[PDB]
Homo-oligomer: 115 residues x 4
């Protein structure tokens, strides 16, 4: 609810389906601990990663396995994965949508933070 | 239903609200005739532009008034507007979502064409 | 060189070579009058479109023939072209670099404006 | 120059000057070992990170300190940084240009890989 991920394919002009997404939370020893994961739906969205009670302020990394995605389509990719590292902040609005647009040699990611 | 437009603001990380959007259809004299328009909602989306019966194959231009949008926020923009010109094609899938990510000196546009 | 265009290929991770580019300048009647044209080089760059003396204040449109570029690669792209529209020199003479990153169903454009 | 980084500012339409860049190379243990570092110049480009002899096959991470760059401009950005992760030289020696386009809540990265 508080955190949603949406992936799109700029080569085929479609949602990016069954893309693996891992979210990590930065721990006090500065290592990344597993926090949430899932695979995008037919609409390229991944919902239900976390809840308001568990999504406390902190630094989060979301990993999008873009390489596996392009491999399964038979298209050489450049990147190992796409990356979005950010600070969740209770001051700001509290719904985070991380959207990624993927090409084999390029990606863009944007955050839409709303109520 | 067949044609949807979604605009996002990469400076504020939010949907781009009350953005004017004009769609034109290319006529046989190669001029652009008015086809549909509206303003994006609070969620940055613009729905109900056209229907399946009216959205025939042809070349369409969609105009996003990005300049007015940045002006009202007090931010100098570079572009007069953002532009997406494309051929609607009955062979391909038939729902078109045109998404635009806006920055003052840059924009990206992507088409997601589904069932 | 007051106006330079650089085009990259997001699918192949390379400059986009031999891409046709047409520039227009909006006249009184609000018709687009042919201004300058050329094709990108091996580096993806197009230099020599215009001169400081010829490139007066005005509203310019840079049309990048993205469709012919994807078609010669066997790809049926979404966009007919990428149009960049902007007011040039209106706060005085500037040097403009219009960069475009191309994918079959997506493109991004940015402007680097220096004094 | 086998590795070059270029950073642009989508808000100001200018190169992103003085942006810190750190490169790591994944070791056996799957830890990221410091590889090279520097800051972009007035042109937004960072040259001289490494040499042909030093830049062997491996998995590299290029971290661009986008947050410090937006903060010195008075902007509180979404991302902690922009990380680019890729396998280099695995089909033989290449020259790599990693380009990033920055906005406060968004970034795009592309790779131009030449032989
Ligand atoms: C919500 O976010 C996006 C949503 C959609 C859609 O909801 O079908 C498309 C693109 C979006 O993002 C992007 C637009 C341009 C570049 C990157 C993503
Ligand atoms: C070397 O590559 C780029 C170069 C320039 C420039 O030469 O001034 C601009 C954008 C570049 O890449 C980008 C293109 C679009 C989006 C992001 C970066």
């Amino acid at each position: 609810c508080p955190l949603m991920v949406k992936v799109l394919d700029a080569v085929r002009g479609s949602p990016a389906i069954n893309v693996a997404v891992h979210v990590f939370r930065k721990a006090a020893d500065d290592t990344w601990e597993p926090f949430a994961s899932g695979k995008t739906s037919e609409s390229g969205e991944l919902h239900g990663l976390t809840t308001e009670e568990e999504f406390v302020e902190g630094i989060y990394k979301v990993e999008i396995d873009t390489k596996s995605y392009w491999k399964a389509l038979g298209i050489s990719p450049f990147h190992e994965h796409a990356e979005v590292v950010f600070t969740a902040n209770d001051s700001g609005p509290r719904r985070y949508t991380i959207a990624a647009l993927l090409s084999p040699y390029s990606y863009s990611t944007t955050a839409v933070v709303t109520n």
